[PDB]
Amino acid sequence: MLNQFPGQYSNNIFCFPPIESETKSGKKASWIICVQVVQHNTIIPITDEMFSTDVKDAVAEIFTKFFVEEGAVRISKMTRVTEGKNLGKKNATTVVHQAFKDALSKYNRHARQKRGNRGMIPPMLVKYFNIIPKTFFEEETDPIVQRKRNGVRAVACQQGDGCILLYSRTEKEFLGLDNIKKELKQLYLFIDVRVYLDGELYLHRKPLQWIAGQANAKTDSSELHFYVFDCFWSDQLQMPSNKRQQLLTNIFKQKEDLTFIHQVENFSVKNVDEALRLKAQFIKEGYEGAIVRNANGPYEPGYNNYHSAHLAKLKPLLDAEFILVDYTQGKKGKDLGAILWVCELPNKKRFVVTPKHLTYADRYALFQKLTPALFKKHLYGKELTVEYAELSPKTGIPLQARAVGFREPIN
DNA sequence: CCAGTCCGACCCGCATCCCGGA
DNA sequence: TCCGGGATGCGTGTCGGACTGG
Ligand SMILES: [Cl-]
């Protein structure tokens, strides 16, 4: 019935069981997902026939409640379920059975990358972009520069049963990279089985889109390689980066004859100009950039997507200009009503860019106030500068795109 | 009083499943 | 059978804001 779903029904509201993660500062945090039943600015009971038939001018509103160990308590701007989906088909979800599976999805998703997950640890993420905090060189040992490969990141560890567990940055297990997993098992017969190996799934001269497809697919072509750049034990996380790289180096001397598993090569540096000279080298060899790691930096897992300040990536930030043609709007929660641009290419294929340095207070206005009559007089045809990481190799659309501003500025 | 977290949305691209119509 | 739409959930990531730890 309705109790298919975990949680408690009270006060016209069904909130799911709290999931509780620990903040980096050691404290306990709680997070609540809840659903309501608004009709004409009012709250209504919870039936078992809103899962069967829709009530007129009745929408379900899903909101989130997050709070610390009793500090301030947020409520999120409601996300309005106006309709169901697949309504003509045999999978027609009414607007409440759908809101209750939309919220239940967020329950299963939100568990990962927290402090639990089969014993997986989220990999460490870098903080600084084209910045090397000068404290990296003010230590007893020099930092390390290695290349950065435009691929999908994966962590390998051996579970108790002896099988190989290869998971992603959000703690999702990769499937069917059997060739890599095969030489991972052979390798684990010679090393401390409690070790984690941190690297990038990658195959040189292949786009990121192709590498991403091979990883997330159940079946696989078994051509990818695994380039390990770091290792750690769940026990000793404070082990400085310089030490971890030295054990990893001898891990790969326990077997120097593999096809799909290779250790990322390490370079020691004493100034910024050495790193950039290596960074320039890496991009001409075809790679994405360079990674700099503080010598005495611990391993800080990416819980709640936390980015460690002991790492930096040096990578070209690409800018170009694209013809503005139209405007649009977000669709869920806080972005409901926020402006988004629509650019267009020579080939005349269109895409969306989120503006930058614009308050949500602004973006609500520039969507409500703008009119096709007004827009056309002032903004249509102008050139929008877009920052991006790379061009879509199959459409030329800039991916990871941001709108910094125009060439002929406006308001 | 901040710098530091953490959240809650989002681009495009890809993989898969379930759907019915051909 | 194949060929879609529609929906979902991955990946590389993005940024604003609302908090909070020191
Ligand atoms: Cl390398």
Author numbering: 1 to 116, 120 to 414
Task: Quote what the paper states about this structure.
AsfvLIG catalyzes the DNA ligation reaction during the base excision repair (BER) process of ASFV genome. AsfvLIG is composed of 419 amino acids and is one of the smallest DNA ligases identified to date. However, unlike the homologous proteins (such as HsLIG1 and SusLIG1), the fidelity of AsfvLIG is very low. By solving four AsfvLIG:DNA complex structures, including the non-catalytic open form and the catalytic closed forms, we showed that the NTD, AD, and OB domains of AsfvLIG undergo a large conformational change during the catalytic assembly.
Among the three catalytic structures, AsfvLIG:CT2 captured one sealed C:T pair, whereas AsfvLIG:CG and AsfvLIG:CT1 captured unsealed C:G and C:T pairs at the catalytic sites, respectively. The structures belong to two different space groups: P212121 for AsfvLIG:CT2 and P21 for both AsfvLIG:CG and AsfvLIG:CT1. The molecular packing of AsfvLIG:CT2 is very different from the other two structures in the crystal lattice. However, as indicated by the low root mean square deviation values (rmsd, about 0.75 Å based on the superposition of 404 pairs of Cα atoms) among them, the three complex structures are very similar to each other. In the AsfvLIG:CT2 structure, the template C11 and the sealed T12 form one H-bond (2.9 Å) between their nucleobases. However, though the pairing and overall shape of C11:T12 pairs are similar in the AsfvLIG:CT1 and AsfvLIG:CT2 structures, superposition reveals some subtle conformational changes at the local regions. Compared to the AsfvLIG:CT1 structure, the C11-T12 pair is shifted about 0.5 Å toward the main chain N atom of Gln403 in the AsfvLIG:CT2 structure, which may exclude the C11-interacting water molecule. Meanwhile, the side chain of Gln403 rotates clock wise around the CG-CD bond for about 15° in the AsfvLIG:CT2 structure, leading to the formation of one H-bond (2.9 Å) between the NE2 atom of Gln403 and the O2 atom of the T12 nucleobase, thereby shifting the conformation to the ligated product.
